[PDB]
Amino acid sequence: VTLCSPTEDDWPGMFLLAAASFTDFIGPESATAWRTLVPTDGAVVVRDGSEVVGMALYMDLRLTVPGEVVLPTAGLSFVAVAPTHRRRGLLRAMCAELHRRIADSGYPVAALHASEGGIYGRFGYGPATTLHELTVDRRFARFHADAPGGGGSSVRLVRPTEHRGEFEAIYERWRQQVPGGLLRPQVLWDELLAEAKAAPGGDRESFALLHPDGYALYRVDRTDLKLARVSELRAVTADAHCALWRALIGLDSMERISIITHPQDPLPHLLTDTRLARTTWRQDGLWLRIMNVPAALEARGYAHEVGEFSTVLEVSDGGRFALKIGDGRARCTPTDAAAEIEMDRDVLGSLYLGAHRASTLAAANRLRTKDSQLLRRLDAAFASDVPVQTAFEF
Amino acid sequence: VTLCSPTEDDWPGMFLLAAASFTDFIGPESATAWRTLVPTDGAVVVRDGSEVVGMALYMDLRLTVPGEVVLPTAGLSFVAVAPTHRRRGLLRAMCAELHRRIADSGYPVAALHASEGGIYGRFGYGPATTLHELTVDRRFARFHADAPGGGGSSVRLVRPTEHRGEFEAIYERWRQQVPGGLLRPQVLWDELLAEAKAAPGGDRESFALLHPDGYALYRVDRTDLKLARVSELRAVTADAHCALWRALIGLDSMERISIITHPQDPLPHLLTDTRLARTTWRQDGLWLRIMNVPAALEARGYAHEVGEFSTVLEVSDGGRFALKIGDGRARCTPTDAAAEIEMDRDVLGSLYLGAHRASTLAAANRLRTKDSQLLRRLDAAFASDVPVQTAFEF
Amino acid sequence: VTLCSPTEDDWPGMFLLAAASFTDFIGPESATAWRTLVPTDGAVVVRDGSEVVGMALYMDLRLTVPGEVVLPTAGLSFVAVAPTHRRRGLLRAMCAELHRRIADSGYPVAALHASEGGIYGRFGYGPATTLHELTVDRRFARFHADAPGGGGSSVRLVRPTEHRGEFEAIYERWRQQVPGGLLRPQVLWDELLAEAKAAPGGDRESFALLHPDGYALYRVDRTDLKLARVSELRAVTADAHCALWRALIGLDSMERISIITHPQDPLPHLLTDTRLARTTWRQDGLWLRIMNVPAALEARGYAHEVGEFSTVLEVSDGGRFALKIGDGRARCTPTDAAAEIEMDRDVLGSLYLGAHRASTLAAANRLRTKDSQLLRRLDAAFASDVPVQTAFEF
Amino acid sequence: VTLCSPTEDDWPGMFLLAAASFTDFIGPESATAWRTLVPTDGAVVVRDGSEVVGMALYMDLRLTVPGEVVLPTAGLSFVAVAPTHRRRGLLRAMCAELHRRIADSGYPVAALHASEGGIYGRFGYGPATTLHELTVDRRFARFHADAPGGGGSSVRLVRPTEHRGEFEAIYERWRQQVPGGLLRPQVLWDELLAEAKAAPGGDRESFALLHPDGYALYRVDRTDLKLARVSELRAVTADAHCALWRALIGLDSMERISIITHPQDPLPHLLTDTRLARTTWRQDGLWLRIMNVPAALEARGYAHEVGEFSTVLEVSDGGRFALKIGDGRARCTPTDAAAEIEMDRDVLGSLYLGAHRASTLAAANRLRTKDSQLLRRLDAAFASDVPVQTAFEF
Numbered sequence A, B, C, D: 001v002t003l004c005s006p007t008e009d010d011w012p013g014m015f016l017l018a019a020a021s022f023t024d025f026i027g028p029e030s031a032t033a034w035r036t037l038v039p040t041d042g043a044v045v046v047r048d049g050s051e052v053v054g055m056a057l058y059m060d061l062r063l064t065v066p067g068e069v070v071l072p073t074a075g076l077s078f079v080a081v082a083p084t085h086r087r088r089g090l091l092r093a094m095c096a097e098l099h100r101r102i103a104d105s106g107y108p109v110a111a112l113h114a115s116e117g118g119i120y121g122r123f124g125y126g127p128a129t130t131l132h133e134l135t136v137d138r139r140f141a142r143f144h145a146d147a148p149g150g151g152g153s154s155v156r157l158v159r160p161t162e163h164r165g166e167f168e169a170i171y172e173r174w175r176q177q178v179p180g181g182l183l184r185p186q187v188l189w190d191e192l193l194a195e196a197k198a199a200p201g202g203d204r205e206s207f208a209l210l211h212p213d214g215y216a217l218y219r220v221d222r223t224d225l226k227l228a229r230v231s232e233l234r235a236v237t238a239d240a241h242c243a244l245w246r247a248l249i250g251l252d253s254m255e256r257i258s259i260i261t262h263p264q265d266p267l268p269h270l271l272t273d274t275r276l277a278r279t280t281w282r283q284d285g286l287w288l289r290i291m292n293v294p295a296a297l298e299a300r301g302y303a304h305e306v307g308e309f310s311t312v313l314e315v316s317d318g319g320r321f322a323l324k325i326g327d328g329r330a331r332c333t334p335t336d337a338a339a340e341i342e343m344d345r346d347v348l349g350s351l352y353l354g355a356h357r358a359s360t361l362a363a364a365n366r367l368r369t370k371d372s373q374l375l376r377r378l379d380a381a382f383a384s385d386v387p388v389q390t391a392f393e394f
């Protein structure tokens, strides 16, 4: 049981473990595309005696954080232990080696999507963004008198494949402007438009709604032909967001439109009946591990409505820092002064993009302090002006 | 078709319309208890030719708003139009007469629970609190190392009826301290403990978990004998909240615990796996209509982390005001100066308890302003330190 | 946290814990009937500081084992830990005290029904009888030419309550003759005929099919009015068993008859289409803990078709014995000779009534031996001529 | 309406009737592979006026029976009557002609899988093996301290297609050793690995778990992506059986593992909680018709624990025999002595592999005798040491 970087001969074995481990695995050509996003020495495999029984890698990603700041981010993915080698500490060993490499490469943060919610908190990952599924009963949906775009429509119904360039440009603007935003490279746009084709005995053809400042990708569900699934909706202005929803509610053959969006999606407020946009499903999105506390805390913007304050943050087994926050900027310096706020590294990941209130984590004792005032100040300071969203699964 | 205050002879006809209109109606003795909360001239009926075909009333309630301030509140309830008299404007007429009486009596706000979400926005009511149903799969539920109370338990399993006094005192402390809090009078405690008994071919016996600083009322579901429904959980400290959840997760015969709680419930953060507390259901709770804008805005506390700022708020058909917010206090005076922020009265109701961000309503154009800075300032100012909750249905 | 025998004042607290712990709990009058079957010092309670947070008791039962031998049996029941006192070792402590008392009273075996299947093996209990639910689609059911009773019917349709004496006598004959048989006292016949009445918004009226040598109790399901549930069918001869099934298949208004029976129920072989009697559900019934290995092994009959053989059985932490089995009788004496067969005490409980083959437990390594021949000999010796059945839940 | 052997021109018509009659029919190339297992004059067709409206054939099979004895077996299959020619006695006529040919060729037994359970008993076929579906909730599954293989795993995760030779050799060992075992020829291994590929809009890719002494083939279900279906698990030792189940329980992405196995599968006993392996489904497997009673009875081994005994067996319309069973061997000679045991030919098929107890068939009067002692002796004699299993559907 050796742990090392895969050579070219190891990848066929990794694709086998992938096929066996991941129900969403497409195949080798698809996996070879994703592979272009893995840097030299971004992958570890565990071999036995030699077949691959363990793998983990990170991709080079660019994550937008509050203040429209873009951080280089280690995107953890393709993590699998062979079912024949469970409870053998192959995960702990592989995660430890990737975190060593990520830390030493100068990534301030690492991110992942969790297949399960009870395995990543112990490695320093906290849930940082929230997914909401909204299901609209569009037969009762009337737009409010106040809703924008209520002449002729600026939204066009188009073949996704013929307007790639327009989607790329709209997404590029979106991701630079929104916390949770990720740069989407060429190979992930190749994959998105591939998954947009009708598969024989699979998914149905996908259509696009195209606005100068927004797009929605949607398809009719395989089995329920009265449900339209919005796979992606990216709007840069409120005009674009409302116009795309007028078009989607205009799908008169459908009973229901479903979308995975965020808790602050304004759609419910566009309707005379907020309740018609039901929350069916709610889950953690992106998980963040802060690799370097001072680098991360200093890199993001803070609320400019919070008055300058100072405190001492202890991260368990992650350092103690004098934290000065003033006019949306933070300075974070080593100190041995008595801590005023204590928290595990994962709790910091959860606060970092403004998705979770410090008051809430405090109420669960994930975040300790004997000062209510400091709690309110952290809450306000760490809050994000632009609501935090999830870019894409990796 | 006359509109007037009911005499004693009208109530049997009102109970008939109630039985026909409300599936949760219990009977005349129950209705006569609720009736003790209706003031002289708090009820209107529409008679035809004379049977009752229309009714509406308000109860005298005490609503806690941010800053632990208690407002007298007109609680709208028992609103019904006979199915034989629909689309005859009996609602508009009855609501108009009650709002006249509520306004002239000096209630700063009115509140209701909506049977439907598309009928109260036009009368100036905005959704002000959010209900979340959490369902825990308690077979996988492990408390975090950081979770309080992890000697001997301070929680007791008791018959609800034998510890009324302890529940009353705990609730009384809870309601004075939490936005959305309502004073619960004697007759509503009589009703709560009545609905806690096993009904022949109805609900099962209810049990209580009693802590010095919290209680939970729970029962096993009628049909699914592996599901425990928490009807009420009121905790005054984080210790009480966690201890009651250790006890509920200790119901080893159950697969699932379900509760109606709020979006900021810390329970998910008490567990090693946040995902085990799934959000199954999400809906508007209390709806608020601001009867007097200056009285309401001046009565609540504001975030003390927001720096003093001034603006002009126009409420559509509800006045224009110079709004000065400073050190958690507001002054609100008539002005004819140009408005900087415009919104319908219902949008103000939605902001009033801090459940909805001004940024979100702005993104839907329910709230108009050409100043991003003022938007962030309203967001921070109107936010509530203590998370907003729903007391009880009326 | 004291462990002691309950006084008269403790029982109200025990009934409270019962109501909270058991969804099948009826009430105090019912519990007080069952209580008549608990001997002096048959109950333990754990008090805190004083409310009951723990209880366990055994009832005095008479269990028929192979060879039509009746053993005094400690029937463990009414076992509950308050949800506020989990993971505090109250079960281990209570079970240890009852086993001390059971052992010292001279019970050779103890029995229970398990609410869950993963908590009793560690206390020496093994699953000893198997329940099968058969569901017959009676619309296709034709009896075989070979099936008995195919003049006039000897089966009568009767009110259960008017023929108590006939049911008692038939059951008394059944239980003396069948492994798994339990003596049913007067108070359990009072309970059976009570649960046979229609409950307002509960179960429907129960009817009896009465043969000189058998009865079936049945009722129509609460919700599915095309399903008849056979609550109990006790037949002393094959004639009685077939006649009662001709009558049940004669319920022409029903689509389905369901019964909880045993794996060797001959019903499938009474039909031209064995498949029409589908096995819907299968579970452990009675669990046995052997309190005294030599007393238990010497008390039961063995297959007379197995030729005299000798071996050494080691029960883990339960003694080592020279085991001589010959002409359906066993002698079991202390030895220090090398063991030829090793097994935990629970594995012995599972073998004791002939429901599980030694070969099967061997294949799972629950039962160790380096002799295939001895395995076949144990299999044949421990097999029961009369198939093993479950009497009633306690 | 003529009955004869098909010429080469009849097969296209037979494939048409197959496609119309069998939902599991794949196509002509697949059918042409199976056809290689049909001997010269193993097929009958009924032509009308000339399209095929009737067909039946047998394949040459090798069935392992108790005592590890391999019998040549007529495997009845591809039996269909056109829906236009029902109730015309085409089945009775075709079955009669194949049984003539099977008898005259010197097959001691014939076997089939029944599409329905009420049509083959009248032709002398009795259900001889039992299928159990086990569904494991693998999230709660913990192996017992006693379970084998609890260093490094000897189980490998492999592509089925790359380890054909290893599966063939393991199966060949399995089938020679187990009652119900069938030789699987090359063309049935071609079919098994063909059905193991992912079909576009069909089944998902199949994976193998490979041990030196066992394999499991498994795939994720089409629709329920949290369920793994074990299509085949063949273990030669208990070590192999437990190791393959440690691997399957190691599929951490799945909630449920389902397998079609036998009533004596030791899996439930490998777990701390036997109940986690639920029996969801139970059905007849292989059906046996004894073509030659003396040849069949003399060919199988009997329990060596049963003391030499003699009796007279009458098979209805199938002969009367002096049956002497001693030291696991039987002699079966014509007699006209008074019968002591009577049964239809199908009842003998059901007893032949030890799946059904003579006591059980006696209790249903499918098997007549006025001697309890002889019944116990038949039970013990006919019982199989190695538990009876089902090889593959034909």
Ligand SMILES: CCN(CC)CCSc1nnc2c3cc(F)ccc3n(C)c2n1
Residues within 6 Å of the ligand: A024, A025, A026, A027, A030, A031, A032, A034, A035, A036, A038, A057, A059, A077, A078, A393, A394
């Ligand atoms: C997470 C969203 N899924 C679509 C439903 C992903 C498609 S399946 C797939 N295949 N190879 C890879 C892969 C290969 C690498 F070398 C690195 C990362 C990869 N990811 C995320 C992969 N995902």
Ligand SMILES: CCN(CC)CCSc1nnc2c3cc(F)ccc3n(C)c2n1
Residues within 6 Å of the ligand: B024, B025, B026, B027, B030, B031, B032, B034, B035, B036, B038, B057, B059, B077, B078, B393, B394
């Ligand atoms: C809203 C919560 N329900 C319990 C499920 C209420 C119980 S049914 C009922 N009956 N009379 C009244 C009544 C009579 C009045 F005069 C005034 C208000 C009333 N409410 C809310 C009532 N509700």
Ligand SMILES: CCN(CC)CCSc1nnc2c3cc(F)ccc3n(C)c2n1
Residues within 6 Å of the ligand: C024, C025, C026, C027, C030, C031, C032, C034, C035, C036, C038, C057, C059, C077, C078, C393, C394
């Ligand atoms: C197990 C079958 N159930 C019927 C569905 C039982 C009815 S509820 C009940 N109540 N008190 C008792 C009780 C009281 C005792 F003191 C001792 C044993 C008891 N059991 C089994 C009890 N069961």
Ligand SMILES: CCN(CC)CCSc1nnc2c3cc(F)ccc3n(C)c2n1
Residues within 6 Å of the ligand: D024, D025, D026, D027, D030, D031, D032, D034, D035, D036, D038, D057, D059, D077, D078, D393, D394
């Ligand atoms: C019973 C298991 N099924 C797989 C699900 C079988 C695959 S479909 C099929 N096609 N042709 C034949 C066939 C052709 C012959 F000439 C003889 C036997 C055959 N069987 C069983 C066949 N089965």
